[PDB]
């Protein structure tokens, strides 16, 4: 916590939280109610982030539904494409016959030290 100590903030901690939810997210839990109206979505970073605060544009109320709610959605964002940097996180770009590009996510180069637990990356928020 950067004010009493230099630390800058290895999201692991975070980082893992995120991953088990969507890790075990092959399936949804029913007791997410809420948005039972409206079309499907899709799993791209911005979506995850808009989840993880526990915010309304959301679709999908299952997983890291508020679990991320200290943060604001662009930093979330920041993160998530931190991860792609890291490539913790893999980022598939996708354009459509429109050249509107967008990205999903999947876990893949640095995924397998995930799984084992040893990943270890940095974020800058207040801590």
């Given at each position: 916590c950067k004010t009493k100590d230099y630390k800058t903030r290895d999201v692991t901690d975070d980082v893992k939280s995120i991953v088990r939810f969507v890790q075990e997210h092959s399936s949804s839990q029913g007791?997410?109610?809420?948005?039972?109206?409206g079309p499907s979505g899709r799993f791209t970073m911005n979506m995850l982030v808009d989840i993880f605060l526990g915010?309304?544009?959301?679709?999908?109320?299952?997983?890291?539904?508020?679990?991320?709610?200290?943060?604001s959605r662009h930093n979330a964002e920041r993160l998530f494409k931190k991860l792609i940097l890291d490539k913790i996180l893999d980022e598939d770009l996708y354009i459509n016959a429109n050249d509107q590009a967008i990205a999903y996510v999947m876990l893949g180069n640095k995924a397998q030290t995930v799984l084992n637990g040893n990943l270890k990356v940095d974020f800058m928020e207040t801590e």
């Open positions: 007791m997410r109610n809420i948005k039972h109206v915010s309304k544009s959301a679709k999908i109320q299952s997983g890291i539904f508020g679990k991320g709610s200290a943060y």
